[PDB]
Amino acid sequence: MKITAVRTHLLEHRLDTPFESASMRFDRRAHVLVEIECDDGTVGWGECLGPARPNAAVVQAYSGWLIGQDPRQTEKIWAVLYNALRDQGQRGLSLTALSGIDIALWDIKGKHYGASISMLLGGRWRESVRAYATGSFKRDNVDRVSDNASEMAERRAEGFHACKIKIGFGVEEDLRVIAAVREAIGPDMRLMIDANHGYTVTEAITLGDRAAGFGIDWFEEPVVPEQLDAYARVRAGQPIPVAGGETWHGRYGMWQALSAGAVDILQPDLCGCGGFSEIQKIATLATLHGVRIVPHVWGTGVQIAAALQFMAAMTPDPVRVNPIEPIMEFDRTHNPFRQAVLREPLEAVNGVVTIPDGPGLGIEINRDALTEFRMPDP
Amino acid sequence: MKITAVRTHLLEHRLDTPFESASMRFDRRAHVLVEIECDDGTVGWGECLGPARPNAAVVQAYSGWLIGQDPRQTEKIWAVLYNALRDQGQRGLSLTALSGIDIALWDIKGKHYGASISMLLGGRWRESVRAYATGSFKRDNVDRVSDNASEMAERRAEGFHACKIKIGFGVEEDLRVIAAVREAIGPDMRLMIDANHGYTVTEAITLGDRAAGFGIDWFEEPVVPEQLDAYARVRAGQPIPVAGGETWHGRYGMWQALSAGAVDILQPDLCGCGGFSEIQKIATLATLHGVRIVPHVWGTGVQIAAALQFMAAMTPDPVRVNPIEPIMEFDRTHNPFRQAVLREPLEAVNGVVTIPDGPGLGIEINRDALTEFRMPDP
Amino acid sequence: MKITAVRTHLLEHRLDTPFESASMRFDRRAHVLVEIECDDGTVGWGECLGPARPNAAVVQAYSGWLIGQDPRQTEKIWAVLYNALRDQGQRGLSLTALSGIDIALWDIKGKHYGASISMLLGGRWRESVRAYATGSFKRDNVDRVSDNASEMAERRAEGFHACKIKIGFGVEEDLRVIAAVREAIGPDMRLMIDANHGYTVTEAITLGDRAAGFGIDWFEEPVVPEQLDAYARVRAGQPIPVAGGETWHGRYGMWQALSAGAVDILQPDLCGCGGFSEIQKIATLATLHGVRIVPHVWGTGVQIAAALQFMAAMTPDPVRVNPIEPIMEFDRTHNPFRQAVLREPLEAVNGVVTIPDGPGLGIEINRDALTEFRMPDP
Amino acid sequence: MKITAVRTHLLEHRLDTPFESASMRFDRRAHVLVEIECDDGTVGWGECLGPARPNAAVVQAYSGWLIGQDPRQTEKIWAVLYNALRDQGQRGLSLTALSGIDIALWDIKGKHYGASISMLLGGRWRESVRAYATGSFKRDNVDRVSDNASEMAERRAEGFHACKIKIGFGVEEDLRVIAAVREAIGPDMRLMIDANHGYTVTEAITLGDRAAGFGIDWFEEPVVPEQLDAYARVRAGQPIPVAGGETWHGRYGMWQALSAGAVDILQPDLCGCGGFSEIQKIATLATLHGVRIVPHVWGTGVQIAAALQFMAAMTPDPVRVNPIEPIMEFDRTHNPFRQAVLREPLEAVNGVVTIPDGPGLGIEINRDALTEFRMPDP
Amino acid sequence: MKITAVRTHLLEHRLDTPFESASMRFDRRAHVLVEIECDDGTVGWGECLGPARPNAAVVQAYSGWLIGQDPRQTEKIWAVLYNALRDQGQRGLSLTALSGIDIALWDIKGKHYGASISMLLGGRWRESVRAYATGSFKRDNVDRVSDNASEMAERRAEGFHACKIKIGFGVEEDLRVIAAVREAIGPDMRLMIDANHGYTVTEAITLGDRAAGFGIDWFEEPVVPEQLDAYARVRAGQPIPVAGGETWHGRYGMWQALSAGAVDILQPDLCGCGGFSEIQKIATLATLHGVRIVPHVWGTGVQIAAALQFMAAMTPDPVRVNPIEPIMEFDRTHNPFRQAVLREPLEAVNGVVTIPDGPGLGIEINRDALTEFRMPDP
């Protein structure tokens, strides 16, 4: 079995108005998929987190080390490609592009052995996960307080057990947003907050001290990803558990954060941290200190399918009866190609997402959707 | 003053036979320049280290935050662009692409103020630097021992005060290469060794212990860039000063290495570490412990010109009469567009390279060479 | 371009009654400016923090290394002069005197290139800053509680968004002062406290625990500048963010404090820490852990102008929309030559200070004021 | 008993040609004495290390806190004056000026109680010390190798048991100088080396490794005083014991160096580190780890007299029969006012200097010499 | 001047009923004085903390190194005697016995120079100190709660500004005692607690958490003196400042505790820690981190006189107007020879104790009291 072709597929949809987090303002949904074809006809699919056209370019640069290789040998291919572009690599785009490749190769490997990826990863502890809803972005002329209060009441009505709202813009308004969301969702629904690294350490500590009374399960990216000493200060300075990981990369970046005691919850993204091959190594590292893994999930149904395979296989830390299980980050904001790339959608039903069990990722790509939402040439 | 256009120029030349280091095998010289044009006509030039097409793609992704901006405001632009692509950035391609942009903007700023970059950086301590020659690569059916012995005798005859040879392939053959080169160059010429991270820690310690008698001024990239504990072990375990930095990025990556006590010589590349804006911050960090900076230099005359501006401005650590000054890494292997991109070559004369003092980088690009050596479309 | 003369100008005004902080009692305003003249006629101005006549003497001792030098080469001159008097230097007067020289040279450099210092520092993120008012000093037979309550209500009426009061004399009376000031300024105006290192660690922790309910944004110089372990204890032992820096010096002194985790806010003074050349290096160091910089500002309009240039150029940490920006420390106590040294005053208008954008510091010295307020010969 | 006057006396002698170390080039001997007079007629004398006119200015700034004070209360006066100028003080000139004041006050205190300072410090362990000779400086057109070889043979012939030569200029020439001096002085005379912080860490380690075979008792100021991590690297990287201290200040600066494990020998200067009051505290600190104190001595007979009082009182670490005793640094280069300031010279006789036992410093100043060598007005 | 005789004087008074702390039960007051006589007739007096007959035996063992020595040379004698018995010494009785000797020698030295010890120590910052009263011991059939409530109301009525009560027996009863004492003394009198190392770490943390609401200025010897990690846990685990030092010894024992961050207040005893010679070194060490010194005082008027001399000389940390000053521990329990050993008592008058200013300790021993209260032969 040999890889014969490696392709990328850029997807875009323009929004009605731009969406803003504290870390970014964007006016379109833009994603990239990786397609790897084999000499026996087998095709695998993956997705890369982050800047879409630059990821496509890095996948193309890796392609020379993929063509002619046996796609079943995922550890060998991962290490060879990791080393090939390591010099001006190590974090960021060199790992997000390798993650998409890795996911496509594990899809091929599952198809070849007739096994779901979750089985090849070592087994299925669970057949479904509870999802949590993520919030809307800041938009021009939209009041964040009432928009988030209504939107999260709407998520509660759909059956989500938890939701996560975007802050990081300014302590006082962010507190008004948190208070209004708690009022709107009632006392039982779980609530998380994500600052998108918008805060200074002092802001993040002040916000956490003042928000903790609203019952907040974690505080995601309080500060920038490079200042691990700042993460540890926020963790020690206010009471809300701190989460991060969607902007860290590989076993070395993740170990740097765990060594620093940066987080209570580590949040590797399948399509960013290095793929299935590397996320299993990151999950090992998290067991040394007992730090919970909850994946970060952002992107199309291909990303969702990959994250679901890993979530079926995640081993509890600790094992006990009815252990703490992963929950699935579910973006509810507008993206017509999120599900359209799949022949069958991977959707929350009363807040719960069932994990496929077919070979590989357990999905079938809709190639007509790739054409329909193709990103226009520059 | 406003930026109106940002372009990249990909350059390629195929070699007669592939060149191999321990870290890579390549069959062509492939580089990318950045061109930034302003509303008043001013044009600046820069270069990005590393994978050429992926760098071009990341420069294109940054371009949206550059158009319409005042190019004189280099710290503002650097921080804005750094944050824009930080999430799946931080090291590697997101910093090598920003370095090329930064260099072009400092070229514009010098042209605008009528000042060499070295002057804007704070002054010229020196008007020239001594260069050292780098060695040939491993080639199919070429004996490394005799090839390096002859090649380095040829560099000595050209007047280079020092040379650096490539090892990392295997302790015993590498020792034969070092011994033959010392014999060939005589007792006075300085000698350095670069393993291109080819060694285990045990190999690197064994090689350094056994090579130290040949008089070796530093041992570059003994081990992989992510294992800073391995660098510190090599530093403590054998007597040759350890050098690294061409595969680290930004103030945070460089501080991580200095904190770890990884190196005796830190080797930021102008076109990789973040450009002039960030290399000044890295040079600050190196003064906290007294670690010598010697830039890494690889690429075309644009990279050479940038590195020379920084070398004129480097402050001695410590200041004394006849202090330890930077020496210029000078690749002598075949590349017809290395100098052709410049209207006037920046060449060693009896081992010494004179540093331009005209506005900006002090060079004039030869646009006809950009066409002649343009990389063929995929 | 060559420096031809270096002069100092001592200024004094006797007060109606002495002013006391916990760290000092003084009966006059006494300051020193530095004037550097060039062979082409260009003149630059600077100011030194601290003992005026001793600063003038240290500037005179540096003058021998300045005459005949190119003033545009600020990094070279800084490093040469720093090394010249380092042996019995390193902190204190050797750095405050060099700061005044450095500021005058950056004023010359901006005039020469036709650029504001803020532009040469890398760009203007902002054109104005909000000022905060500092409080009155302790005076004989004046009740601190009512004096501070009235004075800070008067600052609120002038439009200052925040104010900082002097404590450090004794926990119980200091708490009465803080309580009365909070009552007088209302619930929205921000409040900071400065102990001028008057407290033991135990006093400072007790004061912070008992004062935190009044809403205090930082606690400045709780303890003496040499006991960095005491700073870290105060930071960990009570809830008010700790600030310091006006009594630390250079990259090495500031790094010592940051390494120790001494402060939540670092407060370099342009005229004390080493000038523009060194404060940019200190600002780099603060980004490693994410410690906020808020400059310390004390002295004449020349100091104010220098601090404003640096504040226009300060890069947010982190970058976000509407980031945390520097605020300007504005002494409101009596000093007739504070503004008189400038042809145009740099004053708060409804609490906001606009940052000049002319070449260099963007000011014009009033030489007649230098004569009018000249310090009498000993 | 009350202080009534505090005066300084600046002394200068121009040399025939300038003298150069790696850290400085000077063309005159320039020193400052402190004279403190009391209401009962008692006068005390001291000396300040470092820049003479700036020290005089700082002594004048302290004078306001001295007049009217009881000079017998040396700990109270030290702490009051230390705090008075601490803010822009802490190291350097604020401590060298306080050292001269402190020495004059201990001279007064000894005269008042009819006791040598050595007795008031706690007793005389010894009545004499062996001196070591320091070497000549680098001079224009003088070969350092032969000049040092002849000069040190001349010191050997005068009976000095040891000598210390100046290096720091460049590893190869410095090694030639060390080798020639060892040849010239024979195998028994002790040899020390002082780099005046001229070296990078790499140079200092290389020099120490290559020089150790010549039998070197210590290696003084290998690197700059602010890089304590560099001192520890030099200490660990080559075999010659490392010495420093003449460019550190006070208990906090000295503790910083000892904490860092910077030195095998700590070298406080009576006229730089804080005087008798502070050097006793530094000597305490050195006993925590067992680091030997050997004072640094540079200046006139007043400095020599102060250093001799402290050397009589230094407690062995450890106490044993025939313990390791301090040796006296004795500058032999030309200075006609070194001894002329005293009515009776304090000179080495066959290498040994006898320690006065009269009240205070045990000397009588020659006021006619103060006039003869008075520094010309600026 | 030479020492001719060294004598000890054992004192005893049997109590009506035994007194118990958590650390000890005793039925008599038992103390030892040291008397040192000189060839010129001068006599000095000192006291040793701890077991009286064993201290007398250790003083006798030191006597051989004292006879014939010059008593003015206190640092030489201290170091010689310290080394003489160091091998089976270092802490405990070898230092408490040396402390008594040291005090007698400083008494001789002050008489010889006609100076109070406080002056020889460097000056008098204060002429009096405020005393605090210590509480009664536990006694058979006496209710601790009502006994302490009444006794401390009686101390308040005598004018003491503060008092310290004995706990360490059991958390619940100890809390009842603290509550009753706070009720009895009113809201202003200061309150301290001393567990005499009776508690486990868990008890001490629980007690401090539950007692802090009663307004407690320090918590003395919460745990045993050898478990410095336990001290640091108590300090970090409950809010009352922790004090210790009366059971530590010398610069090395005290530095061990300060290094460990064991205490907020260090409490050397003049008659235990090494005397005046060593307590000055301990006071130096406490300034490195800013830990307050408050001496421990237990014993006769000779101990009281020594402690008062040191308290006059203690330098504020930090210096400020109206700084934090030492307060004097004043045992009020029955001991007829406490004051009888002095010709003039050293007593609190409205809570304040005036510090003698005569030569030496400033006291005159009543030799008739030494006979009257002589301890009966075994």
Ligand SMILES: [Ca+2]
């Ligand atoms: Ca997120």
Ligand SMILES: [Ca+2]
């Ligand atoms: Ca908190």
Ligand SMILES: [Ca+2]
């Ligand atoms: Ca290399």
Ligand SMILES: [Ca+2]
């Ligand atoms: Ca070895």
Ligand SMILES: [Ca+2]
């Ligand atoms: Ca302040």
Ligand SMILES: [Ca+2]
């Ligand atoms: Ca607290």
Ligand SMILES: [Ca+2]
């Ligand atoms: Ca020296």
Ligand SMILES: [Ca+2]
């Ligand atoms: Ca070595």
Ligand SMILES: [Ca+2]
């Ligand atoms: Ca006690």
Ligand SMILES: [Ca+2]
């Ligand atoms: Ca507690």
Ligand code: NI
């Ligand atoms: Ni749509």
Ligand code: NI
């Ligand atoms: Ni060719």
Ligand code: NI
């Ligand atoms: Ni006035």
Ligand code: NI
């Ligand atoms: Ni002469």
Ligand code: NI
């Ligand atoms: Ni009785």
